[PDB]
């Protein structure tokens, strides 16, 4: 499976956007969390289907598939959020009809911090002019790199996606040194995504304990991350 075919396969596997609408009135702490969690819940279902379309993912052991998904889900959700927001500075496009202003992050205690590192990272991806194909590779890499016989099969799958990303950057036409530098600049941002995910999951868990918003079923299983 050549790099182009892998990239092409990821492009097709892109899940359609989940449509959710902003509540009628100005957000309240409860209505914002209900919105964010309802969207996350529905996107998680599609994320599972997306993952199965990633070459070799279904060939890993069920337990590994689970561990990988329990470990990266929020990062994947956020990587998708930043991409949708790439062409809208100061804005977070959670959904077509759910465009949040940084200032709206004031109604939920502690989420404003989250919105900021997301906006900051987005600005960075904007600075670098992240491309669609690049984005596809990176999101897949996040899933396969969340390693937080298949283990060997996993490494091979990550190198396949890495090769694809390398291939995409090469097609841009920049010098060989600049390709290396771009590959580096793009990947140095994964640490930021991982950190944002951590704050996000700590935050959501807190909102749940606070009874600020209900969290149950699939969203919950992912949150607890212990179905195994």
């Amino acid at each position: 499976l050549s790099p182009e075919q892998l990239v092409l396969t990821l492009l097709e596997a892109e899940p359609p956007h989940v449509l959710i609408s902003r509540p009628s009135a100005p957000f309240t702490e409860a209505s914002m969390m209900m919105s964010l969690t309802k969207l996350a819940d529905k996107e998680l279902v599609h994320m599972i289907s997306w993952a199965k379309k990633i070459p070799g993912f279904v060939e890993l052991s069920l337990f590994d598939q689970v561990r990988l998904l329990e470990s990266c889900w929020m990062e994947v959700l956020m990587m998708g959020l930043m991409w949708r927001s790439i062409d809208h500075p100061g804005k977070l496009i959670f959904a077509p009809d759910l465009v949040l202003d940084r200032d709206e992050g004031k109604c939920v205690e502690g989420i404003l911090e989250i919105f900021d590192m997301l906006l900051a990272t987005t600005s960075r991806f904007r600075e670098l002019k992240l491309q669609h194909k690049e984005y596809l590779c990176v999101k897949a890499m996040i899933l396969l790199n969340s390693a937080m016989d298949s283990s060997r099969k996993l490494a091979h799958l990550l190198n396949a996606v890495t090769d694809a990303l390398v291939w995409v950057i090469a097609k841009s036409g920049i010098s060989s040194q600049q390709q290396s530098m771009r590959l580096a600049n793009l990947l140095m941002l994964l640490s930021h995504v991982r950190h944002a995910s951590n704050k996000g999951m700590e935050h959501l868990l807190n909102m749940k304990c606070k009874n600020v918003v209900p969290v149950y079923d699939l969203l919950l299983e992912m949150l607890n991350a212990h179905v195994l």
Binding site: V45, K52, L62, D217, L218, E221
Partner: peptide, 13 residues
Amino acid sequence: SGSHKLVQLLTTT
């Protein structure tokens, strides 16, 4: 708990 909904979506659908 430990088999149901993540696991269901992964192997059932």
